[PDB]
Design a protein around this ligand. Structure first.
Ligand SMILES: O=C(O)c1ccccc1C[S@](=O)c1ccccc1
Ligand SMILES: O=C(O)c1ccccc1C[S@](=O)c1ccccc1
Ligand SMILES: O=C(O)c1ccccc1C[S@](=O)c1ccccc1
Lengths: 281, 281, 281
């Protein structure tokens, strides 16, 4: 199924008929960071499997729902579940849910995910406001927009220089200062590693030379589809480890260590993003 | 359809039957830079759609013709239209037209395209003679030659150290000096960005660290197929903008700005390449 | 055919029924470096084409056999033939033979291949013990593990920090010292170039900036599949040329030059790996 105007319209029509919510804000919350979705008010839960043209996710399994409702008086739509390119999903499968958000009326997309630290000053448990990116799949002919252009959504050649909205970054930092956790919040450049192997010790060292602050396997595909169709983005990384220090000390990482960092910061991140939603223009 | 000896021969046989021209020189002219094709003498226009085994381009649409005739007393063949890998064309689709040129007798291929400037001394409207390249798709398992080797055309493992002919670069500069526009002409290393997003601000900064002078979304696939089968190449970039300066100043780019640079230089580039064709060995 | 538990079990069952050997050690020997396989004792030769679910290799042609027997009193299994990703084989095709080795009981995998030198101190004919890697296909969304995870074999997100076993590297160097050829043996970081074009002059210069010591078109896919399923690895490069010196001197390379280096070192490498097999834990 192509992520075109007709197919995206069929999905939006179904959703409107079931929901009655017209959202202005979309959220994609990474694994371990989804507690806010369980607190959406007056909510409506729509399994992907019932939405016309949504991608098939039964090989990977696990949860897959669209959730609509209110947070802080604002109308929102959340993607509950993982759609990452290391799983083998195509460009068209990643793009269709974001283009459905557009047709439902979304103007701002908020994204969080766990990631590895490269900048030597980043500690486990820190937050990074993403201000730019280095897209290794995109340089290497695996950009999420490779294929025919869908002209109804955006231009053939998009400019990404303002993909990460500056005022949303400033609002997120202001709320951190108000609640006295600004010492946990950094800004930086995100490297997209297609994955699913963690960055190797020698890949990490290369990334430090190249001016990368954080590295991860998510986020950039959704950022590019959003930017192509005029949706503003705020993207935040939660740092699981410092991969440069781990390379110098010969220290390993596992899945239990990463998800324990999510558990440590889940409630603060939930509070932070509730206030952001409440306050954004 | 595979870009093999049988399929390429069927296309060449059709072309010979219609044309009566045996060309020695091939040209691929980028968007906005094609006026020379409209001035080919005693010309014959063959739509791709009528040539056995030529790739299907109706999803992207727009023009798609092979044009044969004379320029400066030389016999040439031109590809009129865009075949770029960010559109989703396969390795086999890109390669077949170049291998047809080979079988028709082409010995020299000339290529022009718009591109982004990285070297700090490059200005909008400058020309760069390409002397080498950094192929990010090729390092990342999307080289145009991934697949079975077609042994009739070339070796399994090609050497690219002389892919950009030195004497053709010298002849192009000599003609610029004769016509007193040598101040617009530079040489440099081309980075292939698969695209279709322009290079991001932070990708541009990385490319400067890595010794790249220019970055673009074209040219390298055709260069590699030509080199594999023994065709000499001259490739020239027309600089649309300096992406390093634009990153430091927070300045954006759009499609209208890029094509306006093509309009500014189209007539000079046409004159330049007519003389090159006339004079090359 | 997917490289899953069921399909790999069907292949292992066939092999056990024919062979009677339960191997502890696997070997993959690169082109020109396979003489040791012709000296396996009490050996049994199984063409890939007769093994359920093994990949089809008839387009590339040439040899394709699994060989089981004894070396130095140890029970081994060898892959005789080339399975490289520049040929167009899929992730699933590369992975299935390694996962069959796992099910047959292999605990250690030894790998050799020809490669290009980047570090300025590397000479034609030198050996490099690989201690880490930079996986350009993996950063660019062509990692060998992209796709659904096969949970019976390993985790969704593998850690590669100990992919190249330290004690096996130490044992290989110790044997070199015993036989007084330690002056030929270096250690270093391997860059994976998907290929099949050799690294260009300007790509080589980039790789030197990025801390790469050697560059090649093999090895890393097998390393990653082995690490995912708990197999220890020793990987050795035979240096064909120094690509940095060749770029500074404008010197080319061809297939006959590369294979002549293999001929020069084949007998010493055979002796070296026989002793390693005899002595490893
Ligand atoms: O995305 C995840 O859920 C995830 C969970 C556990 C492990 C890995 C990932 C993929 S990630 O963006 C990430 C997390 C940690 C380090 C590097 C990259
Ligand atoms: O190729 C084109 O026709 C083109 C036209 C308008 C915009 C972009 C392109 C693709 S390019 O090689 C290029 C042009 C400008 C900057 C970077 C890359
Ligand atoms: O792998 C081979 O058999 C091979 C044989 C002749 C040429 C090239 C290769 C692929 S390689 O890992 C390699 C060899 C030499 C330089 C760079 C890379």
């Amino acid at each position: 199924v192509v992520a075109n105007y007709e197919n995206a319209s069929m999905a939006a029509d179904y959703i409107k008929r079931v929901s009655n919510v017209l959202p202005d804000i979309g959220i994609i919350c990474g694994s371990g960071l989804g507690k806010l979705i369980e607190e959406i008010e007056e909510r409506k839960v729509i399994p992907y499997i019932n939405i016309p043209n949504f991608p098939k996710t039964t090989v990977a399994g696990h949860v897959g729902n669209l959730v609509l409702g209110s947070v802080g008086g604002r109308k929102i739509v959340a993607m509950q579940g993982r759609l990452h390119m290391y799983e083998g999903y195509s460009n068209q499968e990643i793009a269709l849910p974001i283009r459905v958000m557009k047709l439902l009326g979304v103007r701002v997309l908020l994204i969080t995910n766990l990631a590895g630290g490269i900048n030597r000053k980043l500690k486990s448990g820190d937050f990074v406001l993403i201000k730019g990116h280095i897209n290794f799949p995109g340089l290497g002919l695996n950009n999420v927009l490779v294929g025919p252009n869908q002209d109804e959504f955006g231009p053939r050649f998009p400019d990404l220089s303002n993909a990460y909205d500056r005022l949303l970054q400033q609002l997120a930092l202001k709320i951190a200062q108000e609640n006295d956790f600004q010492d946990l919040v950094h800004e930086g450049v995100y490297a997209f590693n297609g994955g699913p192997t963690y960055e190797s010790p020698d890949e990490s060292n290369m990334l430090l030379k190249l001016g990368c602050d954080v590295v991860g396997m998510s986020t950039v595909p959704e950022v590019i589809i959003a930017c192509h169709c005029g949706i503003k983005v705020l993207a935040v990384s939660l740092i699981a480890n410092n991969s440069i220090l781990d390379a110098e000390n010969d220290v390993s990482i596992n899945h239990e260590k990463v998800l324990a960092v999510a558990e440590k910061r889940a409630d603060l991140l939930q509070m932070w993003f509730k206030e952001i939603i409440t306050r954004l223009p």
